[PDB]
Symmetry: D5
Subunit: 162 residues, 10 copies
């Protein structure tokens, strides 16, 4: 019954990568660890430090066979405009990993983070090479996601599986 | 059964007038005519002629007791960011009328224009002073909708409701 | 769920063409664009401009690979008596395209335009060569249908479906 | 269970009488006998003697406290055009009794005469002063209705109910 | 849905013919017309002319390839005692055609003539050579049925079905 | 669950008594014993001694405060014709007690004696002063019922219910 | 529906015969008539003449190809103790036919004689050589069963089935 | 769900005490401990030690505020015949406590010990003063019930329910 | 229905023999007798006499072809920690037999000894060589169960299954 | 639908505190923050550092109006024996906060951490003064719970609510 310990619900969605549109399938990433995270909405007045921190430190995750995937319920087109908007004027700047458009709210619903208001909560899941969910962190409010702690829990999971 | 002829499904939703957020309610427009239109998505590579041409001629609609309302399934923050982008680099510029945020997709649903993809088709309904839908234009593809033609239909409707 | 952007409901019905009874199947028009319109009742005191305008201008539509079909819930025999009544004495005159009998109301119901009175609303549907609805105009009340506006929307649908 | 022996299903409908539209309620004929008959369609090539024979002899029913109501699934507007067409050219000529429009097909259905084709069978029904159905004659095919035999049954119901 | 126009419900029941008990199957009359009639009860005080008139004129039906069957909800034994009572003392006298016993009331029910009192109305059905019901007359009271009118209707149906 | 031991299902039905039609209600015999019996049909070739033996000895039952009722599924009219046929010619002759018509077959059904052929078995029920069933005999064929044994059983029940 | 006229419900049960336990199957008596009777309880203060009269006269049934089976809801062990008690002290004495234990109450229930108290009513049933129930007598109360009248019915069923 | 530790199902039943019939209600024993035991059948060839041992030693149980009730599915009349049979001739003799008739099997079913054979298993239940089951011993087969062991478990239940 | 007499519900669960973990399966004991007992909880202030006295005399059970199995709803790690605690400070010391861990509570459920509190009552079942439950002792409260008495019942059972 | 953001399912259960048995009701703690955590089972061979770390540092949570509650599905009696077993021999040693007995598995089921094997997963929830769940961390495997990070997320929630 619990999402942690079970096989990660698969998905096919539009994403922006290297400022172009492509189709992403979660199970195409098997053989690799995935850090899948949800944030409510693009173009808010909340500083997007939860997305940009992972972009600036993306190299540390590639170098340990981890991909990173960000998800909100905004369209591929909203993601792309937010990525081409500078950090200084409320944007994201270039982004090193895919930003997923959950336009039908099926990914947020499947992972248990969709609220009645039509947006996901703040939430992170670490998925193993065989596609099993080994960790979930879910936040009702905007405070720090520590990138140091995300990486610690992820190295703790790699250690225990080898 | 049919939407045209029936009383307009009501909705309470967030919107953007004058670069501020406000809750708007359809029924709080009874005694004005409403041009309610839907479009797929903010920030597309489709030129937003449909939205901007209504803005640029809004004067004419104010002047025959009519409100204009656009809707998509995008958030209210997305609407503000598209309004605050200049037309020259893919935006709307200042919008003379509320742009409604169907974020839950419930307005599109109740008007029969939500698709399997999670976005609305291009559709325009005309709602009269009493709230009853008198007209619907629904388009699958992008092609310059005639504001001249929309306005003709609004006047023919206005003409027949005073005779 | 939306009619527009889905495959047009097929139908097999009696119609009047060149003053004779004929079986019409919508899907036999695949390869051609179809302007399919609905009006309420034959032999009313409303001028039938929305039907004679398409007759006089039929050539403009045939020259861009387009059939026209009008539909009411009246019988085929009612249609033929209305076609053989002159425009002078309240009728249609000679008509250049088929007029369809929706006598069971199955067509009006499946296109979303059957009222609880047992008649269709005033409605227009453009259907492409592969049998998909691209456009829908539905009116509660009688005014002009602009044949200019129909031709515009049709030709914009034709231009978009090459490029 | 059987229609004959039970209280005639009431209807409110449009009718043509003295070339004008009016609302008929079957229950406002209590106090009078009603001959209620159904025929399939207006403007066919079947000679309408089932309607015209009753009209031509209508004084004979009026003078024995009897109304005649004819019914088909055509509109008020088709009924008027048929009444205003001369017998010589396939019309009815002036009609002496109301012609009822069963546009929704609810009267045909309640009287068990609606076919899968959306038209009624030929049927006649005699309804008494208290609105009970005393007689039904139902025909799959077209041949002469004897007005003399209809009147024989009518007067036999009158004679039995006098005693 | 209407009985008239559809295949006659078949039955296998006891009958009295030529003062003897036999089993009658309706479908074994395929190739002949059938006048099937229903009356309420044997041994009432209503003079039975609706039965005996057909007996006395049976040869006229037999000469146009038509069988006559009478049905009530009484037993074959009640039928035989009634047939063997003289007309002076209340009975039928010899009967030239089968009198069918609908003891389980199934035939009355299937033809739509069974009342809540457990008896049939007075009812008459003309069934063609293929077993389709072409005509029904149904009376709530003893008004008198005309053998001449039955015979005229039957010959009209035979005339129509050869042309 | 067993009928014997429980309150007799009440009935209101037509009967023939003293050559006249009257309505019989079982519960109106409260205060008296009832021999209720059922036989299949009137006017059969089985000699009716099961009915006439009780007629000829009725005074014996009346003198011990007991009514006799006979029931079949035949009409009151069939009952009266049978009562008015002499015993030599197949009938009952005068009958001293009511012969009840179970025309809707409800009484046969409630007492558990209705067969699939739409007739009752031969059955006899003794019902006491409070309306409770104390005895049943039920025969599949005409074996002969003994009035002496019926009478012995009745007096045994009367003897037991006073001590 | 009725038990009488239908194939006797089969049972497999323990019985006492010649003071020993054995399994009885009702269907192994095909070829023979069976008188099957039910009584409430063993060891009551009601004189058991309903059981002992049949035993004392058992040769008379055996010599007309008839078995006698008595049934109650008591156990095989209670039946044996009752058979081994002298008549003088409330027993049966030696019994000439099997006494069947309806310990689960399934036989009482299948024969419609089980009361809400968990015992059977007094009932007798005659079953023929093919295992059809031809006769049933059911009693709410205790009085003399005439063995002569049981034998009269038995032999009447034998005589009717010989012909 | 468990019987043990829940309130004992109440029951109202016929029993035999001091050779007379008495109505026993389990809940009238509130204020006293109850040893309630079940055995299969009276008058078997098994020695009834599990019942005579409790009789001889009844005083030991009454002196610690404890009633005893034995239960079988046999009738009260069966019980009395078994009590009035000497131990020498296969019986109980004089019995110091009530023996209960579970004739409808309702008691055996509600204590969980009714087999599909229609008899109870060998079972024992100790019930405290407030009507709660504290103990259950259930055996498939016949051996000793140790009255020493019952008395032990009872007195340990009594000692625990002070302290 | 009842557990005693029926085949023992099987279970696959973790256990503790010789201070190691092993999966045990009831049915892999067929051809030995099993004493299966349940107790509420590990590490209570109740002296574990029931568990230790069976250990201390296990020799006697090994010697008459019998296994012992204790069960509670506690984890297998809890069982090891209670076994590895000396009797003097609240523990079991070395246990001569498997101690089963009903962690999912499914064994207790299937044996009818799970309470609303989530723990088993004190219960003992004896299962024979073929797997059929022949005995059940169920206790609500804590009182020294007699190992002498349990063993007597196991031998009586053993005695009867060789005769 | 999501447990984070919603009102915390209330419970009444047996617990051990100061080595005695008492009844705990979660809603008796309203007016205070609660850190409610689940661990699989008592008396395992896994070092219980996830329980003892919070016991040793309990004072830091009392001093910021937080109570701590540990839950497994073992009985009140199993908890007490584990608490009176020394750390050196696989026990817990004295314990500064209640250890809850979820004997019927109703608390584990309500919080979404009960597996099919009859035990909770490793999981932590921070509940606000008004009884709303503002955080969830759920782990499929035994690695570090950081007490430093638990306290950071908890101080982040206090900050944002005042």
């Amino acid at each position: 019954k619990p999402l942690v310990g079970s096989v990660a619900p698969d998905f096919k969605a539009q994403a922006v990568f290297d400022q172009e549109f492509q189709e992403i399938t979660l199970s195409k990433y098997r053989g690799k660890y995935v850090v899948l995270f949800f944030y409510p909405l693009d173009f808010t007045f909340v500083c997007p430090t939860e997305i940009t921190a992972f972009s600036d430190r993306y190299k540390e995750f590639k170098d340990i066979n981890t991909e990173v995937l960000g998800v909100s319920v905004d369209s591929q087109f909203t993601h792309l405009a937010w990525i081409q908007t500078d950090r200084k004027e409320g944007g994201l700047g270039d982004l090193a990993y895919p930003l997923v458009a959950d336009l039908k709210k099926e990914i947020s619903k499947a992972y248990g983070v969709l609220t009645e208001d039509g947006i996901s909560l703040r939430g992170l899941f670490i998925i193993d090479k065989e596609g099993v969910v080994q960790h979930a962190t879910i936040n009702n409010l905007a405070f720090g996601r520590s990138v140091d702690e995300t990486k610690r829990v992820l190295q703790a999971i790699q250690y225990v599986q080898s």
